[PDB]
Amino acid sequence: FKPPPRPDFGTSGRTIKLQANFFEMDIPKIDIYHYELDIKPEKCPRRVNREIVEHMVQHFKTQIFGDRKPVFDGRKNLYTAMPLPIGRDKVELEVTLPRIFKVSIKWVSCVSLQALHDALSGRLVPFETIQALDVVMRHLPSMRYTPVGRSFFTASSNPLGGGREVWFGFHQSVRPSLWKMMLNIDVSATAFYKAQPVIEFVCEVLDFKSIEEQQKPLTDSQRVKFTKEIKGLKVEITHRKYRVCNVTRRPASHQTFPLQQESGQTVECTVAQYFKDRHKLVLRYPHLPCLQVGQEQKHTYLPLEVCNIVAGQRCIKKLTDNQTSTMIRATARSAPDRQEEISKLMRSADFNTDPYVREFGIMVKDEMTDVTGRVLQPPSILYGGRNKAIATPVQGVWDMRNKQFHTGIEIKVWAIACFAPQRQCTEVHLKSFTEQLRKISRDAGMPIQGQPCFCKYAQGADSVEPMFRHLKNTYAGLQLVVVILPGKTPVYAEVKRVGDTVLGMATQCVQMKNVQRTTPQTLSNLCLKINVKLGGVNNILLPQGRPPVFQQPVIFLGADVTHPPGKKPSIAAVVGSMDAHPNRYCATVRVQQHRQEIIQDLAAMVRELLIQFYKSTRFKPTRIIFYRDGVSEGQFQQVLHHELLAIREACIKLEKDYQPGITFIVVQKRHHTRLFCTDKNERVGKSGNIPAGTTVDTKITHPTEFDFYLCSHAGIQGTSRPSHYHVLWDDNRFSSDELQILTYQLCHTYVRCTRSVSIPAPAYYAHLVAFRARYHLVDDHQALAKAVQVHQDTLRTMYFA
RNA sequence: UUAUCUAUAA
Ligand SMILES: [Mg+2]
C-alpha cells in the first residue's frame, strides 16, 4: 500500500564527484492561494484557456487582480502569491477574445510551502504543493513556447523527410529531494509535422518530387498509405482548423455529399462542383482524394489543395528506420556537450528574472547540484571450456578471447535456409560463412561439428512452414535452423511463428549483408545467441562473488508491457529465472486491453513461473524479486496496488502456507536525470560519460523513500541514461548496498553481449518477449491468446534472445 | 534479422 522508507545509505564502491542537472530551488515559507476557474465553453484547449486568463487578468486589473501576477495551469487552477479581494464568494465574469467566454472564479484552498519545507525533513509529501510550484515555473514557458507533456519546444530546417521535422526544446520538472526542492532541466528533441500544404505533404509521404508527376488518381496502396499518415492530424483552411478523420476513396471530382436546396430537398453535390459554385474556385487537382474532417455524420470534405498541416503538431506515429537514424544523429551529443547546452539553457531561461517566479518569491541556483557518486565493483564472469576462465569487466565491457562457454552446446546436426537470392548469396558465401562461423564457434566452446546436414534456397513467407515441416520430420535430432534474409521481410515473423509456437524448433536469423562479410566479433556475438537457444550456458556470475540473497532459493522476475503503434491489443510479458546462477529465464506472455499498462493476468503468470521454477530446481523460492519496467507517474499508485497483490495471490493459490518475501522494484529509463563527471579524468570514452557502476542514492533522490540511480552500462554514444530504481515494496528488508550490487550484477547476466547492460537482464528479457509476441501475431481473443502461446519444448529455452 | 548504447515513445 505504502512504499518503504530508505533503510540506509550505500557505502560500497569508490567515491566519484558528480554533477546532476538538478538546480536547487530557494522557496519561501508563504502560503499560495488556490482558486478554481470554470470556463464555458468547457473543452477549449489549454492555450485558449490561457489567453482567456491572460486577458481576464489585464481586463479586471482595477477591481480584481491589481499588480498581482497569477499563474495558471490551463485548466481550472489559478494560483496567486497573495489573496485576491473577493474572499470566498464565487464571481462570474465575462471575457472577450477576438469570442465571448463566461468565467467564474472561487477561492478553494491555501497551499502551505511550510508544509513542504518540513516534508523535505522527515515528517513522512504534499503532491498539491509540488503541483502549485510546477504551475509557477512553467506558466511563462507555456505562453512562450509549444508545450508537450512536461517539455517545451519551438521551431528553429531539420527535416526527417516524410513530412516531419526535428524541433529542439527542453524538459522541465519540479522535484523533491532531501532538504531541497530541485528544478530538473534537460535539453530535448522530438518529431513534429512540417507546417506545409497537404499537397506537399502528399509529395513527401509518397516520394514525389512534384505533384505534377502522378497526374492520375492515387492507387489504393498510395491512397491508404497517405491516409495512415494524415489521419488524426489537424489541418487548416487557407480560405478554420479541422481534424482529419479519414481520406476519401473517390477523387474530388466524383466525391459527393448531401446538399440541401432552398426547396428543402437534398441532392448529392460533388466537392469539385460545390467549391466551384460556393467559393468560385476551380480545383487544380480534382483527380486527388479529399480529407474527411469533423464528425463523420457531417459529411465534411476538403480538397487537398486548400489545406495546410497545422503547425506545432508532434509526431506520435512510429518513425521509419531512416527517420529514426537522422533524428538520433541530429540529437546525439557527448556528456560534456549536453552539460554545456543545459548551462546555456539555464542562462537563456534566466528563471530569476521571470516575473512569475519572482512574484512567488522563488529563486533557482544557476549551478548544477554537486553529488557524490559511488562506482560499484563489477562481478567476475565465470566461463568454462578447458580453461574455466574468469573475465573481469573493464568499463562495463569484457570479451571471450581465450574463453569458452560455461556449458557450450556440442552441435552435431543443423540446417541452413537462405531466403536471399543466390544471385547475391551464392554457395560461395554460405560455405565461407560456415567455415568462419565454425572456427569462431570452435573457439567459443560451442563447437559445430560437421557440415550442415541441409542447405537449400527458398523464397516467400509462404514456404516457411512446409519447409520447416519437412526438416523436423526428416532430420533426427535437428538442433538449429540458420535462416538467411535479405532485409526487412515478413518472412522473419513467419519463421518465428512456426519456430516458436508451431513446431518448436530453434531458429537463428541473419541478414544477407552479414552473410557476405563476416567479422569475428559479429560471429562471436551470433554464437552467444545460438548457444542459449540450444539450452547452453554462455557464462555465469562468479558464485562466491554474489550478494547474500542467493543464500536461500530466490526467483528473479522481469515485467513489461509493449503497446501498439487503435484496436490492437497491448502485450504483457513476465520472465522468471529458473536456476541459481541466474542464467536461464522462462517467459510468460499475455495479450490484454489496448494500451493498458497494468498487467491484468499477472497472478496467473507468476503462478506459472513459480511452477516452472519448482520443476527446474525442486525448490520453492523464499524470495521474489520483481523488476517492473517504468510506469506513468499517476500509474505508480495504480500498478503497485494491482500487481503487488497479484504476486501475493499467486503464492497463496499455490499453497496456503506459502508466503515468500516480495521485493517490488520499478525500473525507469524514461526520465531526464543526467549525471556528469566533475573531474575530467573520470570521463569514459569519446562521449565522456560516467563509468559503468556509478550509483547515486543521495542529494537528488527521494527524501523518505527507497530509490537510487545506477548507471550500469558504458556510455557509447550521446549522454548516458542512468536507470532509476524505486523500491515500492520490500519484505526482505534489503540494505542499500546489497540491492544496488544485486541490481548491478544482474546487468551482467544479459546473454546477447559481453557487456553490462542499462537494466537488469530480467527486465530486458521481458521487453524482448513482449516484442517477439508482436511477430507471432502478424498472420477473436481466444485466437490471439493462442497465437501468442509458445511451443512447450521452446518454452524451456530462451527463444527470445 | 550479431549486439549494446543512444533522440523520441460540406
Ligand atoms: Mg514499458
PDB file of C-alpha atoms in Angstrom, chain A residues 338-576:
ATOM      1  CA  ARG A 338      24.985  18.188 -23.237  1.00  0.00           C
ATOM      2  CA  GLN A 339      26.158  19.557 -19.896  1.00  0.00           C
ATOM      3  CA  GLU A 340      27.067  22.801 -21.661  1.00  0.00           C
ATOM      4  CA  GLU A 341      23.805  23.008 -23.597  1.00  0.00           C
ATOM      5  CA  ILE A 342      21.939  22.725 -20.332  1.00  0.00           C
ATOM      6  CA  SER A 343      24.005  25.529 -18.924  1.00  0.00           C
ATOM      7  CA  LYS A 344      23.229  27.695 -21.859  1.00  0.00           C
ATOM      8  CA  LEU A 345      19.597  26.928 -21.385  1.00  0.00           C
ATOM      9  CA  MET A 346      19.795  27.985 -17.790  1.00  0.00           C
ATOM     10  CA  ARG A 347      21.398  31.236 -18.827  1.00  0.00           C
ATOM     11  CA  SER A 348      18.861  31.727 -21.531  1.00  0.00           C
ATOM     12  CA  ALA A 349      15.837  30.888 -19.414  1.00  0.00           C
ATOM     13  CA  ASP A 350      17.082  33.109 -16.588  1.00  0.00           C
ATOM     14  CA  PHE A 351      14.408  31.962 -14.137  1.00  0.00           C
ATOM     15  CA  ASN A 352      15.458  34.546 -11.553  1.00  0.00           C
ATOM     16  CA  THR A 353      14.173  37.355 -13.793  1.00  0.00           C
ATOM     17  CA  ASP A 354      10.944  35.514 -14.679  1.00  0.00           C
ATOM     18  CA  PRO A 355       8.219  37.847 -13.313  1.00  0.00           C
ATOM     19  CA  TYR A 356       6.047  34.969 -12.078  1.00  0.00           C
ATOM     20  CA  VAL A 357       8.942  33.148 -10.423  1.00  0.00           C
ATOM     21  CA  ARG A 358       9.796  36.499  -8.859  1.00  0.00           C
ATOM     22  CA  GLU A 359       6.158  37.068  -7.900  1.00  0.00           C
ATOM     23  CA  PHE A 360       6.150  33.850  -5.853  1.00  0.00           C
ATOM     24  CA  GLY A 361       9.494  34.690  -4.237  1.00  0.00           C
ATOM     25  CA  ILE A 362      11.185  31.649  -5.760  1.00  0.00           C
ATOM     26  CA  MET A 363      14.874  31.550  -6.680  1.00  0.00           C
ATOM     27  CA  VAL A 364      16.804  28.999  -8.752  1.00  0.00           C
ATOM     28  CA  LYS A 365      20.528  28.299  -8.356  1.00  0.00           C
ATOM     29  CA  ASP A 366      22.454  28.515 -11.635  1.00  0.00           C
ATOM     30  CA  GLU A 367      24.928  25.812 -10.592  1.00  0.00           C
ATOM     31  CA  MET A 368      24.281  22.127 -11.194  1.00  0.00           C
ATOM     32  CA  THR A 369      23.900  20.308  -7.882  1.00  0.00           C
ATOM     33  CA  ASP A 370      27.087  18.637  -6.698  1.00  0.00           C
ATOM     34  CA  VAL A 371      26.614  14.958  -5.889  1.00  0.00           C
ATOM     35  CA  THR A 372      28.946  12.259  -4.600  1.00  0.00           C
ATOM     36  CA  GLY A 373      28.513   9.048  -6.579  1.00  0.00           C
ATOM     37  CA  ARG A 374      29.920   5.581  -5.915  1.00  0.00           C
ATOM     38  CA  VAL A 375      31.420   3.378  -8.635  1.00  0.00           C
ATOM     39  CA  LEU A 376      30.472  -0.170  -7.648  1.00  0.00           C
ATOM     40  CA  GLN A 377      32.888  -3.013  -8.301  1.00  0.00           C
ATOM     41  CA  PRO A 378      31.669  -5.270 -11.140  1.00  0.00           C
ATOM     42  CA  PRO A 379      31.149  -9.030 -10.748  1.00  0.00           C
ATOM     43  CA  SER A 380      33.570 -11.590 -12.131  1.00  0.00           C
ATOM     44  CA  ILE A 381      32.182 -13.613 -15.011  1.00  0.00           C
ATOM     45  CA  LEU A 382      32.984 -17.287 -14.950  1.00  0.00           C
ATOM     46  CA  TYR A 383      33.478 -19.025 -18.248  1.00  0.00           C
ATOM     47  CA  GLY A 384      34.094 -22.684 -18.926  1.00  0.00           C
ATOM     48  CA  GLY A 385      35.683 -24.831 -21.586  1.00  0.00           C
ATOM     49  CA  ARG A 386      39.073 -26.385 -20.981  1.00  0.00           C
ATOM     50  CA  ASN A 387      40.289 -23.144 -19.385  1.00  0.00           C
ATOM     51  CA  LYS A 388      37.471 -22.252 -16.985  1.00  0.00           C
ATOM     52  CA  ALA A 389      38.495 -18.619 -17.427  1.00  0.00           C
ATOM     53  CA  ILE A 390      37.264 -15.690 -15.450  1.00  0.00           C
ATOM     54  CA  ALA A 391      36.512 -12.387 -17.107  1.00  0.00           C
ATOM     55  CA  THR A 392      36.855  -9.137 -15.238  1.00  0.00           C
ATOM     56  CA  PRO A 393      34.641  -6.444 -16.792  1.00  0.00           C
ATOM     57  CA  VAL A 394      36.542  -3.244 -17.602  1.00  0.00           C
ATOM     58  CA  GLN A 395      34.448  -0.110 -18.159  1.00  0.00           C
ATOM     59  CA  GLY A 396      31.338  -2.309 -18.233  1.00  0.00           C
ATOM     60  CA  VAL A 397      32.835  -4.415 -21.023  1.00  0.00           C
ATOM     61  CA  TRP A 398      34.664  -7.721 -21.461  1.00  0.00           C
ATOM     62  CA  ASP A 399      35.283 -10.338 -24.153  1.00  0.00           C
ATOM     63  CA  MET A 400      35.799 -14.045 -24.855  1.00  0.00           C
ATOM     64  CA  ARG A 401      39.412 -14.127 -26.056  1.00  0.00           C
ATOM     65  CA  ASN A 402      40.871 -17.348 -24.625  1.00  0.00           C
ATOM     66  CA  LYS A 403      37.493 -18.117 -23.041  1.00  0.00           C
ATOM     67  CA  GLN A 404      34.843 -20.768 -23.687  1.00  0.00           C
ATOM     68  CA  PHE A 405      31.185 -21.093 -22.656  1.00  0.00           C
ATOM     69  CA  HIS A 406      30.277 -22.334 -19.167  1.00  0.00           C
ATOM     70  CA  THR A 407      28.343 -25.173 -20.781  1.00  0.00           C
ATOM     71  CA  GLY A 408      28.795 -24.975 -24.541  1.00  0.00           C
ATOM     72  CA  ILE A 409      26.366 -26.992 -26.642  1.00  0.00           C
ATOM     73  CA  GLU A 410      28.119 -29.596 -28.768  1.00  0.00           C
ATOM     74  CA  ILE A 411      26.233 -29.078 -32.032  1.00  0.00           C
ATOM     75  CA  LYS A 412      26.326 -32.006 -34.470  1.00  0.00           C
ATOM     76  CA  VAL A 413      23.270 -31.618 -36.722  1.00  0.00           C
ATOM     77  CA  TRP A 414      21.903 -28.355 -38.128  1.00  0.00           C
ATOM     78  CA  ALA A 415      20.374 -26.856 -41.282  1.00  0.00           C
ATOM     79  CA  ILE A 416      20.546 -23.672 -43.371  1.00  0.00           C
ATOM     80  CA  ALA A 417      17.601 -21.963 -45.096  1.00  0.00           C
ATOM     81  CA  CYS A 418      18.598 -18.991 -47.237  1.00  0.00           C
ATOM     82  CA  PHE A 419      15.786 -16.678 -48.349  1.00  0.00           C
ATOM     83  CA  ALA A 420      18.189 -14.345 -50.134  1.00  0.00           C
ATOM     84  CA  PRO A 421      18.567 -14.966 -53.869  1.00  0.00           C
ATOM     85  CA  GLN A 422      21.797 -16.850 -54.612  1.00  0.00           C
ATOM     86  CA  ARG A 423      22.252 -14.175 -57.269  1.00  0.00           C
ATOM     87  CA  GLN A 424      23.573 -12.227 -54.273  1.00  0.00           C
ATOM     88  CA  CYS A 425      24.232 -15.092 -51.848  1.00  0.00           C
ATOM     89  CA  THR A 426      25.977 -17.804 -53.891  1.00  0.00           C
ATOM     90  CA  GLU A 427      27.104 -21.082 -52.318  1.00  0.00           C
ATOM     91  CA  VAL A 428      30.446 -19.268 -52.134  1.00  0.00           C
ATOM     92  CA  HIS A 429      29.182 -17.172 -49.232  1.00  0.00           C
ATOM     93  CA  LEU A 430      27.388 -19.984 -47.403  1.00  0.00           C
ATOM     94  CA  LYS A 431      30.400 -22.306 -47.218  1.00  0.00           C
ATOM     95  CA  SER A 432      32.762 -19.486 -46.235  1.00  0.00           C
ATOM     96  CA  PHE A 433      30.148 -18.230 -43.783  1.00  0.00           C
ATOM     97  CA  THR A 434      30.008 -21.770 -42.414  1.00  0.00           C
ATOM     98  CA  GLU A 435      33.795 -22.056 -42.320  1.00  0.00           C
ATOM     99  CA  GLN A 436      34.333 -18.779 -40.473  1.00  0.00           C
ATOM    100  CA  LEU A 437      31.327 -19.381 -38.204  1.00  0.00           C
ATOM    101  CA  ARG A 438      32.671 -22.754 -37.089  1.00  0.00           C
ATOM    102  CA  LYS A 439      36.208 -21.589 -36.334  1.00  0.00           C
ATOM    103  CA  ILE A 440      34.709 -18.884 -34.143  1.00  0.00           C
ATOM    104  CA  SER A 441      32.308 -21.500 -32.780  1.00  0.00           C
ATOM    105  CA  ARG A 442      35.198 -23.868 -32.043  1.00  0.00           C
ATOM    106  CA  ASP A 443      36.933 -21.066 -30.159  1.00  0.00           C
ATOM    107  CA  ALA A 444      33.721 -20.161 -28.315  1.00  0.00           C
ATOM    108  CA  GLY A 445      33.334 -23.553 -26.631  1.00  0.00           C
ATOM    109  CA  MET A 446      30.200 -24.296 -28.657  1.00  0.00           C
ATOM    110  CA  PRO A 447      31.703 -26.378 -31.460  1.00  0.00           C
ATOM    111  CA  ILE A 448      29.617 -27.084 -34.572  1.00  0.00           C
ATOM    112  CA  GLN A 449      30.730 -30.491 -35.841  1.00  0.00           C
ATOM    113  CA  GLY A 450      30.297 -31.441 -39.497  1.00  0.00           C
ATOM    114  CA  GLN A 451      28.881 -29.516 -42.465  1.00  0.00           C
ATOM    115  CA  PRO A 452      25.197 -28.541 -42.273  1.00  0.00           C
ATOM    116  CA  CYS A 453      23.021 -31.611 -42.836  1.00  0.00           C
ATOM    117  CA  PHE A 454      20.815 -29.440 -45.046  1.00  0.00           C
ATOM    118  CA  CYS A 455      21.273 -26.276 -47.090  1.00  0.00           C
ATOM    119  CA  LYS A 456      18.642 -25.046 -49.546  1.00  0.00           C
ATOM    120  CA  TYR A 457      17.366 -21.829 -51.089  1.00  0.00           C
ATOM    121  CA  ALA A 458      13.738 -20.722 -50.743  1.00  0.00           C
ATOM    122  CA  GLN A 459      11.528 -17.649 -51.167  1.00  0.00           C
ATOM    123  CA  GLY A 460       8.332 -16.159 -49.767  1.00  0.00           C
ATOM    124  CA  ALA A 461       6.916 -16.492 -46.261  1.00  0.00           C
ATOM    125  CA  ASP A 462       4.501 -18.917 -47.906  1.00  0.00           C
ATOM    126  CA  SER A 463       7.233 -21.567 -47.963  1.00  0.00           C
ATOM    127  CA  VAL A 464       8.486 -21.398 -44.369  1.00  0.00           C
ATOM    128  CA  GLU A 465       6.114 -23.794 -42.602  1.00  0.00           C
ATOM    129  CA  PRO A 466       6.184 -26.625 -45.160  1.00  0.00           C
ATOM    130  CA  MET A 467       9.978 -26.294 -45.352  1.00  0.00           C
ATOM    131  CA  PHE A 468      10.139 -26.365 -41.563  1.00  0.00           C
ATOM    132  CA  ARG A 469       7.640 -29.252 -41.543  1.00  0.00           C
ATOM    133  CA  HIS A 470       9.958 -31.175 -43.858  1.00  0.00           C
ATOM    134  CA  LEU A 471      13.076 -30.593 -41.746  1.00  0.00           C
ATOM    135  CA  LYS A 472      11.705 -31.753 -38.378  1.00  0.00           C
ATOM    136  CA  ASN A 473      10.332 -34.915 -39.993  1.00  0.00           C
ATOM    137  CA  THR A 474      13.409 -35.949 -41.985  1.00  0.00           C
ATOM    138  CA  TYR A 475      16.384 -34.952 -39.800  1.00  0.00           C
ATOM    139  CA  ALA A 476      16.675 -36.722 -36.456  1.00  0.00           C
ATOM    140  CA  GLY A 477      17.777 -34.573 -33.535  1.00  0.00           C
ATOM    141  CA  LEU A 478      17.930 -31.412 -35.651  1.00  0.00           C
ATOM    142  CA  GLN A 479      19.199 -28.754 -33.246  1.00  0.00           C
ATOM    143  CA  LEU A 480      19.215 -25.495 -35.223  1.00  0.00           C
ATOM    144  CA  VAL A 481      17.929 -23.859 -38.401  1.00  0.00           C
ATOM    145  CA  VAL A 482      20.011 -20.894 -39.562  1.00  0.00           C
ATOM    146  CA  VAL A 483      17.789 -18.670 -41.702  1.00  0.00           C
ATOM    147  CA  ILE A 484      19.178 -16.030 -44.022  1.00  0.00           C
ATOM    148  CA  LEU A 485      17.267 -12.941 -45.001  1.00  0.00           C
ATOM    149  CA  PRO A 486      17.505 -10.060 -47.479  1.00  0.00           C
ATOM    150  CA  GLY A 487      16.390  -7.216 -45.348  1.00  0.00           C
ATOM    151  CA  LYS A 488      13.134  -6.327 -43.746  1.00  0.00           C
ATOM    152  CA  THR A 489      10.834  -9.167 -44.675  1.00  0.00           C
ATOM    153  CA  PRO A 490       7.629 -10.692 -43.359  1.00  0.00           C
ATOM    154  CA  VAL A 491       9.498 -13.948 -43.630  1.00  0.00           C
ATOM    155  CA  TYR A 492      11.037 -13.219 -40.236  1.00  0.00           C
ATOM    156  CA  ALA A 493       7.676 -13.077 -38.449  1.00  0.00           C
ATOM    157  CA  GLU A 494       6.679 -16.332 -40.136  1.00  0.00           C
ATOM    158  CA  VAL A 495       9.951 -18.056 -39.223  1.00  0.00           C
ATOM    159  CA  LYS A 496       9.426 -17.147 -35.571  1.00  0.00           C
ATOM    160  CA  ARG A 497       5.730 -18.062 -35.595  1.00  0.00           C
ATOM    161  CA  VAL A 498       6.367 -21.569 -36.924  1.00  0.00           C
ATOM    162  CA  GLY A 499       9.603 -21.965 -34.984  1.00  0.00           C
ATOM    163  CA  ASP A 500       8.435 -20.771 -31.569  1.00  0.00           C
ATOM    164  CA  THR A 501       4.728 -21.628 -31.480  1.00  0.00           C
ATOM    165  CA  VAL A 502       4.055 -24.373 -34.053  1.00  0.00           C
ATOM    166  CA  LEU A 503       6.900 -26.876 -34.473  1.00  0.00           C
ATOM    167  CA  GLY A 504       9.114 -25.761 -31.592  1.00  0.00           C
ATOM    168  CA  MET A 505      12.409 -25.530 -33.485  1.00  0.00           C
ATOM    169  CA  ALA A 506      15.298 -23.226 -32.598  1.00  0.00           C
ATOM    170  CA  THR A 507      15.869 -20.725 -35.413  1.00  0.00           C
ATOM    171  CA  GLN A 508      18.683 -18.205 -35.897  1.00  0.00           C
ATOM    172  CA  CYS A 509      18.189 -15.483 -38.499  1.00  0.00           C
ATOM    173  CA  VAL A 510      20.927 -13.330 -40.030  1.00  0.00           C
ATOM    174  CA  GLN A 511      20.957 -10.747 -42.795  1.00  0.00           C
ATOM    175  CA  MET A 512      22.445 -11.224 -46.216  1.00  0.00           C
ATOM    176  CA  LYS A 513      24.894  -8.383 -45.769  1.00  0.00           C
ATOM    177  CA  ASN A 514      26.276 -10.032 -42.677  1.00  0.00           C
ATOM    178  CA  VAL A 515      26.419 -13.317 -44.530  1.00  0.00           C
ATOM    179  CA  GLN A 516      28.642 -11.820 -47.219  1.00  0.00           C
ATOM    180  CA  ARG A 517      31.176 -10.107 -44.970  1.00  0.00           C
ATOM    181  CA  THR A 518      31.824 -11.868 -41.665  1.00  0.00           C
ATOM    182  CA  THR A 519      33.794 -10.374 -38.778  1.00  0.00           C
ATOM    183  CA  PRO A 520      34.898 -12.430 -35.743  1.00  0.00           C
ATOM    184  CA  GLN A 521      33.019 -10.261 -33.231  1.00  0.00           C
ATOM    185  CA  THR A 522      29.779 -10.432 -35.217  1.00  0.00           C
ATOM    186  CA  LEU A 523      30.180 -14.198 -35.487  1.00  0.00           C
ATOM    187  CA  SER A 524      31.093 -14.485 -31.814  1.00  0.00           C
ATOM    188  CA  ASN A 525      28.020 -12.449 -30.855  1.00  0.00           C
ATOM    189  CA  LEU A 526      25.941 -14.693 -33.102  1.00  0.00           C
ATOM    190  CA  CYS A 527      27.259 -17.716 -31.212  1.00  0.00           C
ATOM    191  CA  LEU A 528      26.162 -16.104 -27.936  1.00  0.00           C
ATOM    192  CA  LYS A 529      22.528 -16.233 -29.031  1.00  0.00           C
ATOM    193  CA  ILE A 530      22.738 -19.659 -30.690  1.00  0.00           C
ATOM    194  CA  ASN A 531      24.198 -21.332 -27.596  1.00  0.00           C
ATOM    195  CA  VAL A 532      21.395 -20.298 -25.223  1.00  0.00           C
ATOM    196  CA  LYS A 533      18.673 -21.154 -27.744  1.00  0.00           C
ATOM    197  CA  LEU A 534      20.029 -24.713 -27.600  1.00  0.00           C
ATOM    198  CA  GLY A 535      19.973 -24.695 -23.799  1.00  0.00           C
ATOM    199  CA  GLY A 536      23.629 -23.859 -23.201  1.00  0.00           C
ATOM    200  CA  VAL A 537      25.148 -21.558 -20.578  1.00  0.00           C
ATOM    201  CA  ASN A 538      27.361 -18.835 -22.032  1.00  0.00           C
ATOM    202  CA  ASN A 539      28.617 -17.764 -18.611  1.00  0.00           C
ATOM    203  CA  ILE A 540      27.546 -17.164 -15.017  1.00  0.00           C
ATOM    204  CA  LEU A 541      28.254 -14.702 -12.229  1.00  0.00           C
ATOM    205  CA  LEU A 542      31.117 -15.848 -10.025  1.00  0.00           C
ATOM    206  CA  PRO A 543      29.103 -17.768  -7.395  1.00  0.00           C
ATOM    207  CA  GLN A 544      31.213 -16.651  -4.423  1.00  0.00           C
ATOM    208  CA  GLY A 545      31.126 -13.051  -5.656  1.00  0.00           C
ATOM    209  CA  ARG A 546      27.359 -12.860  -5.156  1.00  0.00           C
ATOM    210  CA  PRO A 547      25.157 -10.963  -2.684  1.00  0.00           C
ATOM    211  CA  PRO A 548      23.815 -12.962   0.301  1.00  0.00           C
ATOM    212  CA  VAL A 549      20.293 -13.026  -1.153  1.00  0.00           C
ATOM    213  CA  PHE A 550      21.384 -16.152  -3.051  1.00  0.00           C
ATOM    214  CA  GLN A 551      21.831 -17.922   0.305  1.00  0.00           C
ATOM    215  CA  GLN A 552      18.294 -19.302   0.085  1.00  0.00           C
ATOM    216  CA  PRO A 553      16.248 -20.052  -3.082  1.00  0.00           C
ATOM    217  CA  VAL A 554      15.214 -16.891  -4.944  1.00  0.00           C
ATOM    218  CA  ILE A 555      13.427 -16.177  -8.229  1.00  0.00           C
ATOM    219  CA  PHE A 556      14.059 -13.040 -10.289  1.00  0.00           C
ATOM    220  CA  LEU A 557      11.209 -11.632 -12.339  1.00  0.00           C
ATOM    221  CA  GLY A 558      11.099  -9.040 -15.089  1.00  0.00           C
ATOM    222  CA  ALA A 559       7.881  -7.440 -16.298  1.00  0.00           C
ATOM    223  CA  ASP A 560       6.967  -5.081 -19.123  1.00  0.00           C
ATOM    224  CA  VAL A 561       4.095  -4.265 -21.494  1.00  0.00           C
ATOM    225  CA  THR A 562       4.525  -3.341 -25.145  1.00  0.00           C
ATOM    226  CA  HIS A 563       1.848  -1.123 -26.676  1.00  0.00           C
ATOM    227  CA  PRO A 564       0.668  -0.936 -30.311  1.00  0.00           C
ATOM    228  CA  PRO A 565       1.588   1.834 -32.798  1.00  0.00           C
ATOM    229  CA  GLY A 566      -6.046   1.546 -32.324  1.00  0.00           C
ATOM    230  CA  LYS A 567      -7.947  -1.711 -31.965  1.00  0.00           C
ATOM    231  CA  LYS A 568      -4.713  -3.655 -31.468  1.00  0.00           C
ATOM    232  CA  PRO A 569      -4.019  -5.184 -28.036  1.00  0.00           C
ATOM    233  CA  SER A 570      -1.116  -4.470 -25.703  1.00  0.00           C
ATOM    234  CA  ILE A 571       1.143  -7.411 -24.856  1.00  0.00           C
ATOM    235  CA  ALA A 572       2.234  -8.162 -21.298  1.00  0.00           C
ATOM    236  CA  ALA A 573       5.365 -10.250 -20.716  1.00  0.00           C
ATOM    237  CA  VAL A 574       6.808 -11.659 -17.494  1.00  0.00           C
ATOM    238  CA  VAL A 575      10.048 -13.654 -17.329  1.00  0.00           C
ATOM    239  CA  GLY A 576      11.394 -15.667 -14.397  1.00  0.00           C
TER     240      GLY A 576
END
